[PDB]
Design an enzyme around this catalytic site. Structure first.
Site, short mmCIF file in Angstrom:
data_model
loop_
_atom_site.label_atom_id
_atom_site.label_comp_id
_atom_site.label_asym_id
_atom_site.label_seq_id
_atom_site.Cartn_x
_atom_site.Cartn_y
_atom_site.Cartn_z
N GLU A 168 0.80 -1.22 0.00
CA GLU A 168 0.00 0.00 0.00
C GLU A 168 0.84 1.27 0.00
O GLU A 168 0.47 2.27 -0.62
CB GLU A 168 -0.94 0.00 1.21
CG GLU A 168 -1.91 -1.17 1.24
CD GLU A 168 -2.93 -1.12 0.12
OE1 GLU A 168 -3.18 -0.02 -0.41
OE2 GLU A 168 -3.49 -2.18 -0.22
N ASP B 22 -6.82 5.42 -6.17
CA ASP B 22 -6.24 4.09 -6.35
C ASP B 22 -6.40 3.64 -7.80
O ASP B 22 -6.82 4.42 -8.66
CB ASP B 22 -6.89 3.08 -5.40
CG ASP B 22 -8.41 3.04 -5.52
OD1 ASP B 22 -8.94 3.26 -6.62
OD2 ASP B 22 -9.07 2.77 -4.49
#
Ligand SMILES: Nc1ncnc2c1ncn2[C@@H]1O[C@H](COP(=O)(O)OP(=O)(O)OP(=O)(O)O)[C@@H](O)[C@H]1O
Ligand SMILES: Nc1ncnc2c1ncn2[C@@H]1O[C@H](COP(=O)(O)OP(=O)(O)OP(=O)(O)O)[C@@H](O)[C@H]1O
Ligand SMILES: [Ca+2]
Ligand SMILES: [Ca+2]
Length: 489
Positions: A84, A93
């Site tokens: 992440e 994202d």
């Protein structure tokens, strides 16, 4: 198991002294300047350098990764931090959804204001899309708990979860962290196989989903985690032209190549099995060693065994002094002849790590015998060679000696007379591939597919080196030749 070498009685004798030294409890001391030890004789004298396979940078028993070992599902935190990353400002994202901190999904709405709203609520203040690292860690802790909670709450996920080992559980938590409880449950097929322990079967059809398609690099790390059940996928995320955990074979292979080329600069290295309490062993191996068979003792580790050479110092040390106070012509020529052999070896094997710290130099100030050379070279630490392919970035893994002023001197006729008759002969190159095969295949993790690539690169290096020698090129002009591979269809 039996360190026998009829071809090399001196080497076998050196190994015998190592074994005898260990029996008398003169154990090899850790070099540590990670998986290397200074092997000593019964008299306490250093006789060799030993590097066990399982203690290599990728080794399972590497003392550097042992912390990761005990934690275990507890490594889901560091695992997710790697997948992440960290961002203190709102961002989109892969799915195009607003996110912040450590992969914390804020909302599926296209509105940046809605995202800021969800963020202010989560943090409990007006952030305007900006948070601190501590705030990111807090949210991360919550998201991890929620992922576990979603797993144990679900009827489909829980069964697969408790039956999984510690490492494979973190993999499932990873998916739930990214896709949530509902989404991960959608993997009905893959979930069943995981339960039945069908690791390979599952790792295949897991790649059959938008999850793998949308984020392949992440999926591949998580899937192999499900497959092998270790942390290998997260050990070295940069890209690697070198195969996994075969450094000892690279150390031995370098010596093999050198001997067949008659270079004689690599201290004789071979695959050797040694047992030593000073080595890093598993708990199960430690406890069992004190059983009664005389005791069972520790299992002998396999690894590269390289003879220690005396009188040498760093190449950097000597090149330094030579640069200041230059050698006489006759001595400098001897140094250059040795340098050429180093160049030939590294290029054929494609050594990725050969700085001035990875090779040594020994400077010592009418007949049937040759007058002894005043200067000599030793090529050590050859564990990072025989790449599966040429590096994506040569600047990241270059031939460091190429930047040396010695690399500008053209290849002498002597090095040409020695090497050309061999590598230009296809029968020699074929036997060389055979010998490397018998040495490499012994490894349990041996992949015939990987080996063909290693050879393709070597044959590509031999192709350039052959022409470079014919054209009387220097080492620098040699490396400047476009890297190529000779692949078999
Ligand atoms: N064959 C040898 N003969 C004499 N000295 C050696 C030999 N091999 C290594 N050494 C010495 O040991 C040191 C470390 O060895 P080596 O680099 O192989 O270890 P390593 O575990 O790979 O560590 P590093 O992280 O520095 O690469 C070298 O700096 C050198 O001083
Ligand atoms: N030290 C080195 N190690 C490995 N390869 C080198 C080295 N120096 C040069 N080369 C090879 O020679 C080629 C030409 O090198 P040069 O010095 O011209 O760099 P460049 O062409 O300016 O940079 P680039 O390689 O990005 O085009 C490079 O493609 C590289 O593969
Ligand atoms: Ca080194
Ligand atoms: Ca090394």
């Amino acid at each position: 198991e039996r360190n026998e070498f009829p071809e090399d009685p001196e080497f076998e004798a050196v190994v015998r002294q190592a074994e005898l030294a260990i029996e008398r409890c003169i154990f090899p001391e850790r070099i540590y300047q990670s998986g290397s030890y200074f092997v000593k004789d019964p008299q306490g004298r250093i006789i060799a350098v030993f590097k066990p396979k399982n203690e290599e940078p990728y080794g399972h028993l590497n003392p550097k990764w042992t912390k990761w070992l005990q934690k275990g599902t507890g490594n889901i935190f560091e695992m997710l931090r790697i997948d992440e990353g960290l961002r203190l400002k709102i961002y989109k994202d892969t799915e195009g959804y607003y996110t912040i901190g450590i992969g914390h999904l804020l909302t599926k709405s296209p509105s940046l204001n809605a995202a800021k709203s969800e963020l202010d609520k989560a943090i409990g203040r007006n952030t305007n899309g900006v948070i601190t690292k501590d705030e990111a860690e807090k949210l991360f802790n919550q998201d991890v708990d929620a992922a576990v909670r979603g797993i144990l709450r679900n009827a489909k996920l829980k069964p697969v979860y408790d039956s999984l080992d510690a490492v494979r559980r973190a993999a499932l938590i990873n998916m739930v962290f990214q896709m949530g409880e509902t989404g991960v449950a959608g993997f009905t097929n893959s979930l069943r196989m995981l339960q039945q322990k069908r690791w390979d079967e599952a790792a295949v059809n897991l790649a059959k989903s938008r999850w793998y398609n949308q984020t392949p690099n992440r999926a591949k790390r998580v899937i192999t985690t499900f497959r092998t059940g270790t942390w290998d996928a997260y050990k070295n995320l940069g890209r690697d032209c070198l195969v996994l955990n075969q450094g000892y074979l690279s150390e031995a292979g370098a010596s093999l190549v050198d001997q067949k080329l008659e270079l004689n600069i690599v201290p004789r290295t071979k695959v050797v099995y040694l047992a030593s309490e000073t080595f890093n062993y598993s708990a199960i191996d430690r406890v069992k060693s004190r059983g009664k068979r005389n005791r069972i003792g520790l299992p002998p580790k396999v690894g590269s065994f390289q003879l220690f050479v005396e009188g040498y110092k760093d190449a950097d040390y000597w090149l330094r002094r030579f640069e200041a106070e230059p050698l006489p012509e006759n001595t400098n020529r001897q140094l250059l002849l040795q340098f050429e052999r180093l160049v030939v070896l590294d290029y054929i094997i494609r050594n990725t790590d050969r700085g001035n710290d990875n090779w040594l130099i020994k400077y010592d100030c009418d007949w049937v015998v040759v007058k002894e050379p005043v200067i000599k070279v030793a090529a050590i630490d050859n564990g990072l060679a025989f790449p599966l392919k040429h590096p994506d970035s040569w600047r990241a893994y270059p031939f460091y000696w190429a930047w040396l002023p010695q690399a500008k001197v053209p290849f002498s006729q002597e090095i040409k007379d020695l090497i050309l008759p061999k590598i230009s002969d296809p029968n020699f190159v074929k036997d060389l591939e055979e010998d490397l095969y018998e040495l490499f295949k012994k490894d349990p993790g041996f992949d015939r597919g990987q080996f063909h690539k290693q050879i393709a690169v070597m044959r590509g290096q031999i192709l350039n080196l052959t022409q470079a020698l014919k054209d009387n090129k220097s080492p620098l002009h040699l490396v400047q030749m476009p890297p190529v591979i000779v692949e078999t269809a």
